[PDB]
């Protein structure tokens, strides 16, 4: 069942950039040593990406909250997470996120990741309770507090039971098909996603074929809801976080290496120099 | 750094025409409107 959250407080949302971040292979083909121009929904270069701290910390003393508001889903969402303790555990997608219409549930658990398509009855604050230090010994005990009732489980997929890290995710809902692109990368001392270049490969195509307009996030309740403990209930005082981006129709010029891996690309509609590069079909322009 | 040139247009409609970002050295020539270069 679902339990309430006690301390809420507030903190103004922060911003950061996503310079050359969030590029995925458009089609499933092989190229080599050839730059090619495509046209698909991408994250624009140098974009204002919203920032949420997994623990909405009012003070490092122990005053905490969860920063999990419902957010729009407009022609795609760029999702990534840097963390050190697997706080993020899944997401819910839909339009009203109620039992009236079908919704998609995809949640990672301490045993296995679960994918369901049912008419769940979502509460205001769905979460995953964690009892890492709640019991006498130090061991991982989870808790399921996402929804109340589930109906019409049209689709079901489950997995077998089983130093900050970035985990980029790209979601796209077209032609009744849901697309997931991911990538793993080790990292360190990065309050915000660092700069560089990486390619997101497809993970699974999946034929839900329903209407998604809004979405939210599933977090790990490291504390309890009645009385967690001494203080500092959240881990590392909100160091765990995630960011949200919005893809827009653009036109890109991907460059493939000899091994067929995408190495660099430009945004044709950012600055006149890039427009020239796209027109001349090259990465270098003479006087 | 690059400079853009619009062909044969008065430097009055160029704002409402990569943002122009207001008037910053909008030097006008017979060829057209020249942006981003000093005379």
């Amino acid at each position, epitope marked *: 069942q679902c339990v309430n959250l006690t301390t809420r407080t507030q903190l103004p949302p*922060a911003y*950061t*950039n996503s310079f050359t971040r969030g590029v995925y292979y458009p089609d499933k083909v092989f190229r080599s040593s050839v730059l090619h121009s495509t046209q698909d929904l991408f994250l624009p270069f*140098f974009s204002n990406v919203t920032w949420f701290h997994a623990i909405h910390v009012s003070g490092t003393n122990g005053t905490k909250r969860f920063d999990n508001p419902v957010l729009p889903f407009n022609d795609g969402v760029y999702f990534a997470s840097t963390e050190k303790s697997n706080i993020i555990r899944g997401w819910i997608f839909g339009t009203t996120l109620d039992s009236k219409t079908q919704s998609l549930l995809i949640v990672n658990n301490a045993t296995n990741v679960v994918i369901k398509v049912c008419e769940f009855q979502f509460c205001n604050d769905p979460f995953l309770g964690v009892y890492y230090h709640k019991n006498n010994k130090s061991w991982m005990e989870s808790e399921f507090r996402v929804y109340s009732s589930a109906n019409n489980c049209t689709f079901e997929y489950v997995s077998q039971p089983f130093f900050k890290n970035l985990r980029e995710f790209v979601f796209k809902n077209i032609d009744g098909y849901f697309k997931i692109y991911s990538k793993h990368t080790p990292i360190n001392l990065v309050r915000d996603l660092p*700069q560089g270049f990486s390619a997101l490969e497809p993970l699974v195509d999946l034929p839900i074929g329903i209407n998604i307009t809004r979405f939210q996030t599933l977090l790990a309740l490291h504390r309890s809801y009645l009385t967690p403990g001494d203080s500092s209930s959240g881990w590392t005082a909100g160091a765990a976080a995630y960011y949200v981006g919005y893809l827009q129709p653009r036109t890109f010029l991907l460059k493939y290496n000899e091994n067929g891996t995408i190495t660099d690309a430009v945004d044709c509609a950012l*600055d006149p120099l890039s427009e020239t590069k796209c027109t001349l079909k090259s990465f270098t322009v003479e006087k | *750094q690059v400079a853009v040139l619009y062909q044969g247009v008065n430097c009055t409609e160029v704002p409402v025409a990569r*943002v122009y970002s*207001t008037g*910053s050295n909008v030097f006008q020539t017979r060829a057209g409107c020249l942006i981003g270069a000093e005379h």
Partner: nanobody
Amino acid sequence: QVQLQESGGGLVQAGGSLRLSCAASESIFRMELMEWYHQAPGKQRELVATINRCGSTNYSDSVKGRFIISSDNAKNSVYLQMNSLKDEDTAVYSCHARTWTSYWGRGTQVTVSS
């Protein structure tokens, strides 16, 4: 609209505290470079502090230890706090930005009383 406006100038005695604040309408983040220029009367313009997009920060030799340049990502602007003011710090300060074409601002004439 002035794409980059500067504020904070005025008169002040030596050794005081001051915070130059110039704000730009455009995102301070895709601009890729913030810098501050002040020119002494009878002297050429000189650079004060530069902050690139990545986050690297540099200060002039007569700037280290006292002047720190910062930029809060809540209201798009760049901040520059002055302290331990000395009389040759009196100049006309201007903050410079360059996304793909030079931009400039006006005002902020600081005077150090000694």
